[PDB]
Amino acid sequence: PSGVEGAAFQSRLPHDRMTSQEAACFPDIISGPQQTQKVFLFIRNRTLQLWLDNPKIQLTFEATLQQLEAPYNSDTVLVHRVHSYLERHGLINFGIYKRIKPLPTKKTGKVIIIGSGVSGLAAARQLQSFGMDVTLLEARDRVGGRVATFRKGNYVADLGAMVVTGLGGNPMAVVSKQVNMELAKIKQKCPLYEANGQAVPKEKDEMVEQEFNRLLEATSYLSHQLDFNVLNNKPVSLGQALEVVIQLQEKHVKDEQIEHWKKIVKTQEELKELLNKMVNLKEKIKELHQQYKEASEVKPPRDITAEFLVKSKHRDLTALCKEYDELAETQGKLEEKLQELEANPPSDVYLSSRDRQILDWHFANLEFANATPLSTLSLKHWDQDDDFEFTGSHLTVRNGYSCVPVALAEGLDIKLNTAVRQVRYTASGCEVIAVNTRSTSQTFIYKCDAVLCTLPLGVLKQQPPAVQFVPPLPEWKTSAVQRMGFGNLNKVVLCFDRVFWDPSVNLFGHVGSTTASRGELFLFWNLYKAPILLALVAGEAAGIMENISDDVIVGRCLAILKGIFGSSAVPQPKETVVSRWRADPWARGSYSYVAAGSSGNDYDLMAQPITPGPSIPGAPQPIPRLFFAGEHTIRNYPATVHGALLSGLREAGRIADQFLGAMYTL
Amino acid sequence: RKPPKGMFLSQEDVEAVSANATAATTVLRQLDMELVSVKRQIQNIKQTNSALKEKLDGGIEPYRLPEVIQKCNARWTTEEQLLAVQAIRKYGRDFQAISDVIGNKSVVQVKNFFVNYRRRFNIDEVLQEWEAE
Numbered sequence: 001p002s003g004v005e006g007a008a009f010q011s012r013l014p015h016d017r018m019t020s021q022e023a024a025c026f027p028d029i030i031s032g033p034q035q036t037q038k039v040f041l042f043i044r045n046r047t048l049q050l051w052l053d054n055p056k057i058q059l060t061f062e063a064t065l066q067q068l069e070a071p072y073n074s075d076t077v078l079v080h081r082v083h084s085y086l087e088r089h090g091l092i093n094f095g096i097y098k099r100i101k102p103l104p105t106k107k108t109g110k111v112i113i114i115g116s117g118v119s120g121l122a123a124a125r126q127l128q129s130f131g132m133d134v135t136l137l138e139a140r141d142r143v144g145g146r147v148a149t150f151r152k153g154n155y156v157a158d159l160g161a162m163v164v165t166g167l168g169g170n171p172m173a174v175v176s177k178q179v180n181m182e183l184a185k186i187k188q189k190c191p192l193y194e195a196n197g198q199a200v201p202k203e204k205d206e207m208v209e210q211e212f213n214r215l216l217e218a219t220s221y222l223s224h225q226l227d228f229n230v231l232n233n234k235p236v237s238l239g240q241a242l243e244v245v246i247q248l249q250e251k252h253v254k255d256e257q258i259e260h261w262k263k264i265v266k267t268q269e270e271l272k273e274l275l276n277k278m279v280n281l282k283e284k285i286k287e288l289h290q291q292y293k294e295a296s297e298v299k300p301p302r303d304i305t306a307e308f309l310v311k312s313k314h315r316d317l318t319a320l321c322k323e324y325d326e327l328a329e330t331q332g333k334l335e336e337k338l339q340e341l342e343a344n345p346p347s348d349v350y351l352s353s354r355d356r357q358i359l360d361w362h363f364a365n366l367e368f369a370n371a372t373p374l375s376t377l378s379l380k381h382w383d384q385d386d387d388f389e390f391t392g393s394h395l396t397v398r399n400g401y402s403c404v405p406v407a408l409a410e411g412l413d414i415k416l417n418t419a420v421r422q423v424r425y426t427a428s429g430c431e432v433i434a435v436n437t438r439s440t441s442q443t444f445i446y447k448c449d450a451v452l453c454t455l456p457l458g459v460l461k462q463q464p465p466a467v468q469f470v471p472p473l474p475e476w477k478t479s480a481v482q483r484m485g486f487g488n489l490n491k492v493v494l495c496f497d498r499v500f501w502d503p504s505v506n507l508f509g510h511v512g513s514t515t516a517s518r519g520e521l522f523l524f525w526n527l528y529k530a531p532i533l534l535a536l537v538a539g540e541a542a543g544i545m546e547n548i549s550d551d552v553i554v555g556r557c558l559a560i561l562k563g564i565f566g567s568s569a570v571p572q573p574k575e576t577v578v579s580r581w582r583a584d585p586w587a588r589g590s591y592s593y594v595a596a597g598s599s600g601n602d603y604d605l606m607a608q609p610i611t612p613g614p615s616i617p618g619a620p621q622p623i624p625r626l627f628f629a630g631e632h633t634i635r636n637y638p639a640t641v642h643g644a645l646l647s648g649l650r651e652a653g654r655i656a657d658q659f660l661g662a663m664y665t666l
Numbered sequence: 667r668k669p670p671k672g673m674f675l676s677q678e679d680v681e682a683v684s685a686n687a688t689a690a691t692t693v694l695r696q697l698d699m700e701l702v703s704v705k706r707q708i709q710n711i712k713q714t715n716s717a718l719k720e721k722l723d724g725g726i727e728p729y730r731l732p733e734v735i736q737k738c739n740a741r742w743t744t745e746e747q748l749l750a751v752q753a754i755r756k757y758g759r760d761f762q763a764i765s766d767v768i769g770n771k772s773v774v775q776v777k778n779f780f781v782n783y784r785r786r787f788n789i790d791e792v793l794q795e796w797e798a799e
């Protein structure tokens with residue numbers, strides 16, 4: 001869209017309806033007359049617009065009202081309520097901006113934030129923007145968490161997040177005007193290169209891809225239309241569905257073949273019966289002819305019976321010759337029909353070994369984008385986030401994505417190398433026990449009103465636990481952690497002195513020998529101006545290539561590259577780096593997925609903060625002490641940076657509503 | 667409501683390929699049995715038919731008779747009358763044959779005959795004897 005509707009879309013909000021959220025804070029309005037709803041909606045949209053049009057500077061309630069015109073700038077309580085709500089829930093004045101009103105002299109409430117992930121950093125900035133006291137606790141020596149950026153010399157390369165998945169309603173749009181990120185598009189053309197190093201011919205590439213896309217739709221159809229979502233007592237993965245689909249495709253191909261050769265035999269047996277008739281005619285014909293000779297032997301003059309005989313037999317014989325000629329017309333029709341069926345046979349196989357291999361690369365790309373084997377994804381639910389997809393070209397951050405976390409952390413109180421080991425929350429407050437990662441013995445204690453836990457799901461999943469919760473997290477929460485999926489993906493950075501690949505092609509694929517190894521080094525990116533090639537590991541393979549040494553991995557990499565561009569065109573790499581995210585103790589994996597037997601609904605369970613039992617028995621229901629944010633908490637944008645960011649902003653908002661109250665709700 | 671075009675996904679089929687650990691490889695084997703056994707049956711009938719086609723070698727050219735072109739004449743000769751009566755005896759009521767034997771009397775002329783002389787040639791008696799065969 002464009003105009004004010006353009007702001008509403010660009011802020012992931014319907015321009016023409018009030019959200020569930022807004023209903024909660026403005027239940028007067030949304031239960032009220034339509035006319036006033038549209039005033040509200042315009043105000044919201046309009047204010048959004050203003051912020052968006054210049055997100056480098058705070059948007060004050062005064063500057064907001066000043067830009068409005070009547071009727072809309074009449075009810076200035078309404079304008080105030082709106083502007084505050086937007087401020088609060090991070091729709092405006094979020095990220096990095098020149099504050100107009102310097103920060104409150106005195107802070108109120110105290111919040112300890114576990115992890116300076118993007119979620120962490122986002123929340124922190126908001127709360128401290130709100131004036132609350134915030135301190136962040138980061139086990140790693142640097143901010144960013146899963147936003148890691150390799151730098152050496154002029155080589156720059158993300159081993160973590162790399163891509164902004166569209167700017168259309170993506171908050172990172174806003175951030176990108178606040179921070180100068182060298183955003184650069186990705187040309188989506190990806191040429192394949194078989195096992196041997198031969199480019200796949202366009203014929204095949206197109207055929208296989210289409211078959212892939214068709215197979216996916218197939219699964220989706222199995223899911224919704226046939227309700228094949230539970231097999232045996234267990235749920236069905238995307239993987240099983242695809243197998244069942246493909247089994248049914250090979251089944252069909254044989255069924256085709258069967259009924260085609262069954263046509264041929266049913267025809268062939270007609271022809272057989274026709275030939276027996278034709279032979280038994282030819283026999284009565286020989287015999288009649290003989291009799292007709294023997295009756296013309298008798299020489300004129302002959303009596304009349306003798307004459308009858310000749311004429312009789314002459315007629316009987318020309319009848320049979322007529323009949324036989326019409327059988328031989330029939331014979332010709334069948335014999336040509338059979339030559340046509342022989343000529344037009346159904347396809348021999350569903351897919352060849354070369355086809356299936358290419359289809360496997362397309363599955364490995366799916367396994368990479370979800371970060372897990374398709375045998376783990378939920379059939380029904382894996383794709384659920386696809387509806388909220390942004391619009392626009394996907395992009396890379398050319399100067400490294402770390403520029404973002406780094407910039408977010410400016411002005412915050414972040415304790416590096418401090419490994420949270422225990423979270424204690426009680427009716428009256430919380431204490432967080434950390435250690436120093438350098439020195440396990442040296443111990444820290446932090447007391448606060450509330451704890452915001454951005455600990456990656458991998459961590460929350462750890463058994464036995466890296467972090468202890470006192471008291472334990474409720475079964476409803478532990479089951480969410482258990483049911484949900486945490487995946488893995490890995491990157492190999494290859495830094496070369498000179499460019500030997502196609503400078504106009506961002507990415508190209510390598511096709512694996514087997515099904516087992518389809519993911520292994522299946523894809524290469526050339527996004528960086530500098531001579532850097534990234535090789536991606538995925539699927540089952542990622543999990544195993546963590547156990548193989550870097551020298552070996554870079555080997556296998558160069559092997560593939562030489563095979564595609566030739567032994568004398570591929571140098572040694574000047575610098576090499578290999579991720580292992582499932583190894584990393586502070587991530588314990590790469591990002592989340594929707595495991596089979598899991599629902600989008602679990603991502604909500606994860607965000608649900610926790611309220612302790614009361615200190616004194618029979619005392620009032622206390623405030624909710626523990627809060628969660630991060631990539632695995634936002635149902636509509638999981639496994640993303642923007643997702644995390646959004647989740648941070650969301651808890652900041654919820655926390656301040658709790659601890660500084662909501663003026664807007666009146 | 668509809669599988670993508672050229673994907674085939676029957677309710678019944680799904681249950682068939684899913685019901686066991688390898689009810690899937692079972693089904694796809696027994697289709698390779700059916701397939702190879704039908705291809706065998708094709709071989710037998712190709713061979714059988716090729717033998718029968720070599721028995722008909724030469725067509726029926728040796729046994730065919732050139733064609734008599736005679737013009738349908740209204741006069742019965744006594745020759746032709748006698749031919750007729752015997753033709754009846756042997757052919758019953760088949761007029762096309764009786765016309766073809768006599769070789770110069772249309773099918774109508776034959777029916778006519780049948781009634782004209784029925785009395786004098788007991789075409790009754792002749793025809794009930796034809797029926798005896």
Ligand SMILES: Cc1cc2nc3c(=O)[nH]c(=O)nc-3n(C[C@H](O)[C@H](O)[C@H](O)COP(=O)(O)OP(=O)(O)OC[C@H]3O[C@@H](n4cnc5c(N)ncnc54)[C@H](O)[C@@H]3O)c2cc1C
Binds near residue numbers: 116140146164630
């Ligand atoms: C290889 C890879 C590529 C990716 N690519 C993309 C992409 O291209 N585009 C995209 O949109 N998204 C991408 N993502 C996802 C995205 O980076 C993350 O989901 C996002 O950074 C999540 O931030 P978070 O704040 O929830 O978690 P994190 O950023 O991991 O933050 C958690 C923080 O907690 C710290 N921590 C853990 N345990 C403790 C402890 N005990 N005490 C103290 N601190 C602790 C961690 O060290 C970390 O700083 C990618 C992820 C990976 C792994």
